Design an enzyme around this catalytic site. Sequence first.
Site, PDB file in Angstrom:
ATOM      1  N   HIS A  41       0.839  -1.219   0.000  1.00 42.40           N
ATOM      2  CA  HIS A  41       0.000   0.000   0.000  1.00 42.40           C
ATOM      3  C   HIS A  41       0.869   1.263   0.000  1.00 42.40           C
ATOM      4  CE1 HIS A  41      -0.196  -0.400   4.558  1.00 42.40           C
ATOM      5  NE2 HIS A  41       0.197   0.858   4.378  1.00 42.40           N
ATOM      6  N   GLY A 143       2.255   5.852  10.006  1.00 46.26           N
ATOM      7  CA  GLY A 143       3.684   5.782   9.694  1.00 46.26           C
ATOM      8  C   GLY A 143       4.319   4.468  10.147  1.00 46.26           C
ATOM      9  N   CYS A 145       3.405   1.393   9.443  1.00 44.46           N
ATOM     10  CA  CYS A 145       3.261   0.272   8.482  1.00 44.46           C
ATOM     11  C   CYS A 145       4.635  -0.224   8.039  1.00 44.46           C
ATOM     12  CB  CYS A 145       2.362   0.596   7.310  1.00 44.46           C
ATOM     13  SG  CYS A 145       0.744   1.147   7.886  1.00 44.46           S
TER      14      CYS A 145
END
Lengths: 305, 305
Positions: A41, A143, A145
């Site tokens: 993503h 942030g 991820c």
Amino acid sequence: SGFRKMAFPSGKVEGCMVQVTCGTTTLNGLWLDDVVYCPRHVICTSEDMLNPNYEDLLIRKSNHNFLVQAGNVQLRVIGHSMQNCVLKLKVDTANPKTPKYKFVRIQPGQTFSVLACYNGSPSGVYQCAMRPNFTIKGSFLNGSCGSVGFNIDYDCVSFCYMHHMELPTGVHAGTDLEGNFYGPFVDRQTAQAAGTDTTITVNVLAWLYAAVINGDRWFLNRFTTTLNDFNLVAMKYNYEPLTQDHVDILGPLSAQTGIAVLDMCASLKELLQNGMNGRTILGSALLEDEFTPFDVVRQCSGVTF
Amino acid sequence: SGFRKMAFPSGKVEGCMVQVTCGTTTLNGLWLDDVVYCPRHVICTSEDMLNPNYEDLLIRKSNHNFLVQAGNVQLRVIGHSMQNCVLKLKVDTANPKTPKYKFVRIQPGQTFSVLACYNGSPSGVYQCAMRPNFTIKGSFLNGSCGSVGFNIDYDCVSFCYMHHMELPTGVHAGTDLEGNFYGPFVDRQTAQAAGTDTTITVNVLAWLYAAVINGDRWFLNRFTTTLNDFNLVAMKYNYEPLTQDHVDILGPLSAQTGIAVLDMCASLKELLQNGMNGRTILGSALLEDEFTPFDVVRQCSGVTF
Ligand SMILES: O=C1N[C@]2(C[C@H](C3CCC3)C2)C(=O)N1c1cncc(F)c1
Ligand SMILES: O=C1N[C@]2(C[C@H](C3CCC3)C2)C(=O)N1c1cncc(F)c1
């Protein structure tokens, strides 16, 4: 003595964390040998998040669009591929800090340490469990991820989790390192049912053994039970069924304390039926299910890496 | 979102851990620049432990009696001095993995991460608080002495704790890195009174703010209180008195949430007087006092090192 929610030492993983930027999105990657792993993503924009067409989004990207920085040093991307929900960026330099490692898909009720990272910089380390419903109850901000979860055995890091998203309920979902989600989840900004969670019964019993080893013994009683009777109580209180395979893994703790597993089950049955009556066990006023039997033995035997 | 008991990333400290051997006793040392620091009780035998004459024991030792090993590699000891309850061994090699570091003596109610080690090898990492009575509730087995506690700010490790002993009550005692004990403790195998302990009020308030930020808000109520009224309740429940300096350090969490510090005090009053029923706050059925206001802001703002 004492009993704490203990994480693995994070150094071997700290040296694998990188920042990955694609367009305006920055998140964390894992640099092992000459490959950087990160959530796919990273290639989305806000427009995309309801139902991204990841194949079409990735077709618009070139190696030079993926900005990868390991502390202050820029890595050169020489290939990219999507595997399930992860991107694999091939880089021209092997990570000189690569530990001995394995990728593993863990079972629900297993525990692991998380190294929470922002912009490729480690923030903190904590222990948690894979819930029976394949969510995790972490601490992750925007942030985080690409932050990873792992176990360490001797010199070998077993990576089991990469963080992908927060569900609208505020629990966390992510993938193994081949990019397969744990649980039914998809990487789309949609309400997604986790479905029924349960308490990890074998872990509660391991923690009660940990309590006895530390001299917290008030909940021991004069009773015993059967596996069948106990599992009737477990079902009533939304506990996982106990199997003989669970009894078998509790053997070392039964042997150390001299308390037969079904005797400890009768203690747990009485705690489920009666509550704690305002008492604590190992500093907790509820029954703790995030220590595996292996965790309890390791903490109680002082194993190192 | 989510709130976990988070430790600092341990890699910068892992690189400083060594094994120190004197006679038949092995414990951990901390190798910084060209000095190894360890508990002076490494030089005792079992005959000695009731009341060691550390001056006379250290006189019987020469540089060559202190075996210092970093992973596989032996360090050469070229000097030794006792400073309070720590030994300082000068080695001929500066640790190449020495981080930017400070020695700091922390205040009661402050938090730090502990890297638990055995034979100079890291086992696990956890967060904990210096109790108001200068004990720590750790997880330490035989061989863990010389394990250290620390905080990290930017790239700088502040070492605040070195583990020395388990009291007969099973709580932990140790020194700053100048070898001064926290609390009234001495490095002798004697029964030793720890003072009356209290709950760290300013930390419980910080954790209630953390709870609101994460949307656990059931304990907020229609009431307010005063600092004097609150402190009468604090004394009845063995809570530390709340001072204006405490109110001041909660300022940022008050501003973030719009909940006045004294409103939050009236929530805590009601929790102390009524308990939690059978509800939970951030996964806990008791009031948590091991998060500082600084800890809450860091975890809620995603600061990295
Ligand atoms: O940083 C992001 N971005 C997404 C991923 C993204 C969804 C839409 C594609 C999948 C929305 C997310 O869930 N978080 C996040 C994670 N963990 C804790 C947080 F607070 C936020
Ligand atoms: O390994 C040691 N040895 C001493 C130090 C030593 C005392 C008597 C001189 C000072 C006895 C100790 O307290 N521990 C220990 C520490 N932490 C958890 C444990 F389980 C044991």
